[PDB]
Design a protein around this nucleic acid. Structure first.
Ligand SMILES: [Mg+2]
Ligand SMILES: [Mg+2]
Ligand SMILES: [Mg+2]
Ligand SMILES: [Mg+2]
Ligand SMILES: [Mg+2]
Ligand SMILES: [Mg+2]
Ligand SMILES: [Mg+2]
Ligand SMILES: [Mg+2]
Ligand SMILES: [Mg+2]
Ligand SMILES: [Mg+2]
Lengths: 103, 101, 100, 140, 166, 97, 275
RNA sequence: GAAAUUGGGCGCAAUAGAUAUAGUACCGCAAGGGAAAGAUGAAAAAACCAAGCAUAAUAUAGCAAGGACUAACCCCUAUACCUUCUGCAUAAUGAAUUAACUAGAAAUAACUUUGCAAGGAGAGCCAAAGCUAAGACCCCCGAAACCAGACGA
């Protein structure tokens, strides 16, 4: 609800639209298991579309870690220091490609 | 809806605008332009020859997770649903005006 | 032992030299391999010299010498996915590590 | 007990994280919390119809407050801004009255000129030429 | 069972810099399983909760309750500990910062009632925790004057915005 | 607070045990062993259900008939009471008729 | 003991979140954390700002002076920052006055110099530097990076951009990141003035206009604890400003501020900056 | 309801599993009923999480919240839940609260999916597309009683 949860005012980071638009992602960090069915779509995202993604915005520096995890995570870090760590566990390739473009 | 819009401000719309972040957008359908000493107001819109309201796109977020719960007493009727409506944020860059009167 | 195989540039005449050793006639690419011994002597000479054996799943697909020619001019390359990704012309903000 | 529930702690905290700001034992005891957390969620969605009602009632009470400063009533302003095809809604008209009172004085001047053009057309029945601000713009 | 209050006297802070004010001593002390109830101890623990240790020993010598004879045994052992073990030079330079009472492990006996029915009588026990901080006691908070109520009202008028608009 | 504070010791399962690596051998001893043995002769368990599947009433009827002559004295009385109960449940109670 | 593993694992990770909500750790800088490559973050630093640097000359803009001393201290157990930071501080002072003397010509050189000291102060630059990932890339000794060093690192980036792409691209880098920090801010929230009534007598004497006669235009509830006055500043019986206040002295001290804004061109309804 | 005839664990792990640490303590004249519970470490010859409280009593107004808000309350909106009913805020039932335990068991026929097919099925049985195999539907607590055998004046 709204009386339980905090609230804020609609703002931007550093007047993000006035002079120029600065892309607000700094990093994406993928943990992706080499053997594991939970990261089946996450392996196909790295194989197919993370190279098309890392050229569409050269300000985001992307780290694919590739360690033996059960749950693959994506750790989006932004320009104001905020960290939004989300999971791509058992998601198809079309569902990670919109989850990352949302980030 | 109708947004009272000045320059260098922000607007939050509750739908995806199928745009890229950063694309400058000319908002048509201006229907009242005012200054400290005059105002011009259309019938019902001002012409495109007269006003040019620019807007960038900053962020294409989702809303905060926003609950829909249904309940009826003594009927075992209880539903819960959590929706996040997609949102976009426009920054109005300039309200130019041209002498076409 | 290494699974990698590059098709030689003269495998057209290298296979033709092995057909003339196991037999010769005109249109040498349409010789039917219906004989069990004749398919053995041809494919053992190719697998020993070139170092690439026909798998049991693909051994029945070879009814002609045309089909033996098509198998030996496709390049297989079995390397790790680390070496496949990190040598696939990464843009300068892709960093890939392997904890294995 | 072959398989009994091992994760019942996290099902309680799905409800009890919404109740942390309550009073009494509704913030602690789970049996008392679900009858209020459910009831706090139904009120959260039934008040999406009352926010749009209570904002428009607020906008009407802020247009009625500012139109009385120029001697207009509320139905004499909205009814004659429509007749000039000035399709401003209640949100902007209540935000013009606070933040731009010169423009709102011009909309009260326009809605009173059209009102006087509506009376002068009505007292002079029969065919008379229309008022100046009473001419509609047609779209085809 | 837990005994975390006894272990707070073993925290060793790093040795101080001379460009830093002197850290006051803290002396955590407790007695467990006092045959007295935990909410009859609260009236004695609330009484001494801001006082200096010499005024606390004065107001407990003349209280008629049972626990005042027990707190005065706790406050005297914690004052003797502060000059011995925790390096306070003055006995009089202490005040009670925290003075609470938890419940202890209570025993159960049978109380017979007037018929075949009965009740379950519980023999109450309690704890008493104290912390002495080295220093003079801080002064009690005065009531906020009419100047301070007028500032808060004018600051509440000054802070209000035009709500539900631009 | 019914949840443990320390995570349990790790379950090490040898997937190449004797009973695991040779599991399933001779389940087709009929159809490629000249049908001398049925695979129902390969299952080891109680006498009254070596190659037989029934519900709870048909199991207690079969246990009383096959091995009930040598059952213990208050295990036979606990079984006779169970068939006397499961008769009345399956034949008189229930939703569908 | 309820058998199983998946619920005992989740509770082990809800205890570790509560161990950081009860005892939060000290902040560690970004380079001592996983997933960090210092060469790749600088090339991503350039393309993020839609501008291109000479990447070796940008690498020397981030290494400070205190870092080289404490890199030689641990060597018992590189260029500095000052050259590029002096070019960037000196240019962005003359670039910002050229921006503000062109948009506000009526403002005096006292008020322009007090505007550049706001736009290049520690409150604006170290707020701008923390949201362009300059603290992440800077090489200092102590963390969090002190605002005296982070301001030196930010102007070294502008100094490095001057040598990379000339003074045309660099003035657009100052226009988009330093001049945007005055949006919505009043003039005297940037240029704090003691005695604005006496500063208005000096400026009205500059235009050869009469000294203003402060006149009480409107008032309400003078005998209460919540009064409202409207002191207007009339000169030659024509007002230049009116101002509100709780008393007459505040409403007169504020009516000089409204007339000072109307003289220097810094009103609330002035023409906004062009981008 | 016949007969001829035919021939070690996809268990429990201290409210579980035995009632069982024990048929002990305790209860009854007796037959009989019948519990509860323990957790260090290689060696003792070495924290964080329930209810409940405390830290820290309370400020006009009302199902204890929600919309909100600069702001905890003030403003506006809102007649707890379950069960039973024509219909319950009902002044109808149940419930102090926490932790744990506590309630849908199966047939022919149909359906779905395979195998094989005028045949199917590892004898028996069915078959005018059938037949074999699988999957999928049938609760918990509660009387006053009745009878048999002991134990009690
Ligand atoms: Mg009691
Ligand atoms: Mg027979
Ligand atoms: Mg037991
Ligand atoms: Mg608690
Ligand atoms: Mg009310
Ligand atoms: Mg009713
Ligand atoms: Mg009731
Ligand atoms: Mg009833
Ligand atoms: Mg009751
Ligand atoms: Mg007698």
């Amino acid at each position: 609800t709204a009386r339980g949860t905090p609230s804020r005012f609609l703002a931007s980071v550093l007047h993000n639209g006035l002079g120029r638009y600065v892309q607000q992602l700094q990093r994406l960090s993928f943990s992706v298991s080499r053997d594991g069915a939970s990261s089946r779509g996450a392996r196909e995202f790295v194989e197919r579309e993370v190279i098309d993604f890392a050229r569409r915005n050269p300000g985001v520096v992307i780290y694919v870690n590739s360690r033996p995890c059960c749950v693959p995570r994506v750790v989006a870090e932004y320009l104001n220091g905020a960290v939004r760590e989300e999971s791509i566990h058992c998601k198809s390739v079309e569902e990670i490609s919109t989850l990352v473009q949302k980030l | 809806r109708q947004w009272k819009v000045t320059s260098e401000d922000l607007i939050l719309i509750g739908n995806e605008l199928d745009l890229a972040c950063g694309e400058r957008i000319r908002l048509e359908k201006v229907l009242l332009v005012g200054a400290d000493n005059f105002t011009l107001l259309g019938k019902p819109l001002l012409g495109k020859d007269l006003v040019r309201v620019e807007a960038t796109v900053i962020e294409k977020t989702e809303s905060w997770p926003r609950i829909i719960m249904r309940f009826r007493k003594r009927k075992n009727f209880k539903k819960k649903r959590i929706v996040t409506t997609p949102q976009t944020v426009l920054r109005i860059n300039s309200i130019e005006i041209a002498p076409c009167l | 032992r290494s699974r990698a195989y590059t098709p030689p540039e003269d495998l057209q005449s290298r296979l033709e030299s092995y057909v003339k050793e196991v037999f010769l006639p005109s249109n040498w690419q349409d010789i039917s391999l219906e004989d069990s011994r004749l398919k053995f002597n041809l494919l053992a000479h190719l697998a020993d010299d070139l170092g690439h054996v026909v798998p049991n799943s693909r051994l029945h697909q070879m009814c002609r010498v045309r089909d033996v020619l098509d198998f030996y001019n496709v390049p297989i390359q079995d390397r790790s996915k680390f070496d496949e990704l990190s040598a696939s012309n990464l843009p300068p903000n892709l960093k890939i590590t392997w904890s294995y | 007990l072959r398989n009994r529930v091992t994760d019942r702690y996290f099902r309680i905290q799905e409800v009890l994280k919404h109740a942390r700001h309550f009073r009494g034992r509704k913030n602690r005891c789970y049996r008392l919390a679900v009858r209020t957390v459910i009831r706090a969620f139904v009120k959260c969605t039934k008040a999406r119809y009352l926010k749009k009602k209570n904002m428009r009632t607020l906008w009407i009470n802020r247009i009625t407050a500012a139109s009385q400063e120029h001697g207009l009533k509320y139905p004499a302003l909205i009814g004659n801004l429509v007749k000039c095809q000035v399709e401003l809604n209640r949100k902007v008209l209540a935000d013009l009255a606070i933040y731009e009172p010169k423009t709102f004085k011009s909309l009260a001047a326009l809605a009173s000129r059209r009102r006087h053009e509506g009376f002068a057309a009505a007292l002079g029945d029969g065919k008379e030429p229309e008022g100046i601000f009473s001419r509609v713009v047609q779209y085809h | 069972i837990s005994r975390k209050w006894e272990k707070k006297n073993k925290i060793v802070y790093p040795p101080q810099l001379p460009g830093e004010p002197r850290r006051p001593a803290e002396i955590y002390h407790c007695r467990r399983q006092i045959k007295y109830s935990k909410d009859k101890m609260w009236y004695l623990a609330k009484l001494i909760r801001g006082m200096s240790i010499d005024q606390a020993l004065a107001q407990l010598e003349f209280n008629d309750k049972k626990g005042a004879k027990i707190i005065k045994e706790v406050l005297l052992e914690a004052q003797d500990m502060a000059v011995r073990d925790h390096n306070v030079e003055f006995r009089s330079n202490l005040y009670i910062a925290e003075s609470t009472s938890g419940r202890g492990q209570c025993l159960k006996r049978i109380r017979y009632h007037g018929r075949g029915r009965f009740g379950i009588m519980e023999k109450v026990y309690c704890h008493y925790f104290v912390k002495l901080v080295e220093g003079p006691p801080p002064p009690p908070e005065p009531p906020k004057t009419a100047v301070a109520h007028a500032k808060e009202y004018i600051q509440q008028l000054r802070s209000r915005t035009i709500v539900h608009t631009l | 607070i019914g949840i443990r504070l320390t995570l349990p010791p790790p379950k090490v399962v040898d997937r190449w045990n004797e009973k695991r690596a040779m599991f399933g051998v001779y389940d087709n001893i009929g159809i490629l062993g000249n049908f001398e043995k049925h695979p129902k002769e390969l299952i080891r368990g109680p006498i009254w259900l070596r190659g037989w599947k029934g519900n709870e009433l048909q199991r207690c009827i079969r246990k009383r008939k096959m091995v009930g002559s040598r059952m213990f004295a208050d295990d036979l009385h606990n079984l006779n009471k169970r068939i006397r109960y499961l008769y009345k449940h399956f034949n008189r109670h229930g939703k569908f008729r | 003991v309820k058998k199983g593993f998946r619920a005992a694992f989740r509770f082990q990770k809800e205890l570790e979140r509560q161990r950081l909500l009860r005892c939060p750790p000290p902040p560690v800088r970004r380079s001592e954390k996983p997933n960090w490559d210092y060469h790749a973050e600088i090339q991503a630093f350039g393309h993020r700002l839609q501008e291109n640097f000479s990447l070796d000359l940008l690498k020397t803009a981030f290494v400070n002076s205190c870092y080289i001393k404490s890199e030689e201290a641990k060597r018992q157990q590189l260029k500095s920052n000052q050259e590029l930071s002096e070019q960037g501080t000196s240019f962005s002072q003359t670039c910002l006055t050229q921006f503000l003397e062109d948009e506000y010509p009526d403002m005096p050189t006292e008020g322009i110099k007090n505007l550049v000291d706001f736009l290049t102060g520690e409150e604006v630059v170290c707020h701008v530097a923390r949201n362009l990932a300059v603290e992440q890339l800077t090489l200092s000794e102590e963390f969090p990076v002190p605002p005296a060093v982070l301001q030196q690192t930010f102007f070294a980036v502008i100094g490095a951009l001057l040598q990379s792409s000339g003074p045309e691209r660099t003035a657009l880098f100052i226009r988009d990141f330093l001049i945007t920090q005055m949006t919505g801010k009043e003039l005297f929230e940037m240029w704090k003035i003691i005695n604005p009534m006496g500063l208005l007598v000096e400026e009205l004497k500059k235009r050869n206009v009469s000294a203003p006669e402060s006149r009480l235009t409107r008032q309400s509830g003078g005998t209460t604890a919540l009064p409202l006055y409207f002191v207007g500043l009339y000169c030659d019986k024509k007002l230049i400003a009116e101002g509100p206040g709780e008393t007459v002295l505040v409403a007169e001290e504020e009516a000089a501020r409204v007339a000072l804004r109307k003289l220097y061109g810094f009103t609330e309804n002035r023409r906004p900056w062009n981008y």
